[PDB]
Design a protein around this ligand. Structure first.
Ligand code: TV0
Ligand code: TV0
Lengths: 231, 231
């Protein structure tokens, strides 16, 4: 994040905002970094921001001590993503390729409300702050719907945990599988919502990209649409 | 903070919570570290937490770009202090000597509301989240009222900035002096409030310590009262 100059408070409209949307529980770091690189090649000051940037040091406690930590850790995801966008995209006019946009955090609170880890009153408070924060951030310019199947997410996650490339964030194998499945199910509904909101809701000025196709064809399609934005 | 093991998510009622309250714009790091050391000497797992632990990387923008950054940076102070207390004090039962408690953050939002940097609607949202967060954190056990005069805060700050021991967080000398004076004035009112709330409000189970006396006498008085808590 220091190499990407994400946290520079020095002097400098907004830049461009590209976001993946889907249950990327094992991450899309290669895709967002390759995409940001292609935008740099075209002349943009572009950075690919993986969710790991927003992992609070207390992240594991959201899953092992959910009734206590899910609310404040969800506030953290929203707040840190907000600040990073407000500084890099809005204030400094940079081009952001995000693993997840500010529109998708509320779904993760909904999951914890349904399990009882976040109370209805906590959710109402979250929604009031989220409304004020999101009103200051532009909608993404290009949203790419990419929701992999849970079995694939879980195979990738299991290999990464076994090889030590990321910590075991969940308190049991079953809890890992359950959270990943709950997020997948919620993302199927959110993606149906996206198709409506892009046509008849608040995203009419945003390009919504859905993918057909090999992984090479998918990267090529996303890159072509993102490059339409580079000035 | 790594030496103090502040961010350990491993396995383990709450511990003890001692807080200074006042316009410590130049910091009370020596006092809180000496006090935490005295509690360690008596056998407590005690740590002194200065406000620098909660300085967001974007802190300077609260003062140079207040209309955009004061709201989310104030959310950050509240949230990070909340999480640190929820983990260290509540979950892990450690003894926390805080430069500032969770009860004092709202005053800093009030300052930005009065200047127009935070809107009334943003403040209402902040208050709703703050109420939910604070309901999960015990009141401090010992609160020490220490509000130095602004001229002293500013002399200390000027020397620290000139010697490079901390960054210049403010966009002009006048803005630094103005914020420090506004915080001092608000803290005089908050300290009047504290004297009422300790007797007839929500702090009746807390020891409120006010200081007469040399700096040596002040440290000795605070240390004696904090040591009454070490088991
Ligand atoms: N608002 C959010 C955003 C992301 N995530 C998790 S945290 C993670 O990146 C760990 O690798 C992955 O599990 C995401 O699903 C969340 O719980 N809440
Ligand atoms: N909720 C809060 C808590 C602390 N502070 C400032 S940040 C500081 O520590 C910089 O050294 C000092 O200026 C404090 O007064 C704030 O602006 N808002």
């Amino acid at each position: 994040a220091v190499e990407q100059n994400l946290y520079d408070v020095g002097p400098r409209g907004p830049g461009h905002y590209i976001a993946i949307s889907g249950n990327t529980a094992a991450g899309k770091t290669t895709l967002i970094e390759t995409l940001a690189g292609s935008l740099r090649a075209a002349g943009a000051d572009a950075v690919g921001v993986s969710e790991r940037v927003f992992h609070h040091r207390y992240l594991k406690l959201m899953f092992s001590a959910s009734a206590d930590f899910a609310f404040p850790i969800q506030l953290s995801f929203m707040l840190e993503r907000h600040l990073l966008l407000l500084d890099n995209l809005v204030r400094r006019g940079r081009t952001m390729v995000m693993e997840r946009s500010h529109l998708d955090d509320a779904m993760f609170v909904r999951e914890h409300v349904a399990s009882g880890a976040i109370t209805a009153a906590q959710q109402r408070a979250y929604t009031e702050v989220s409304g004020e924060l999101n009103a200051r951030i532009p909608n993404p310019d290009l949203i790419v719907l990419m929701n992999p199947e849970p079995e694939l997410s879980l195979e990738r996650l299991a290999r990464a945990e076994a090889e030590g490339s990321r910590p075991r964030e969940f308190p049991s194998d079953a809890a890992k599988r359950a959270w990943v499945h709950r997020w997948y199910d919620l993302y199927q509904e959110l993606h149906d919502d996206y198709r409506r909101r892009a046509v008849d809701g608040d995203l009419r000025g945003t390009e919504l990209l859905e993918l057909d196709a090999s992984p090479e064809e998918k990267i090529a399609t996303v890159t072509a649409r993102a490059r339409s934005l580079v000035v």
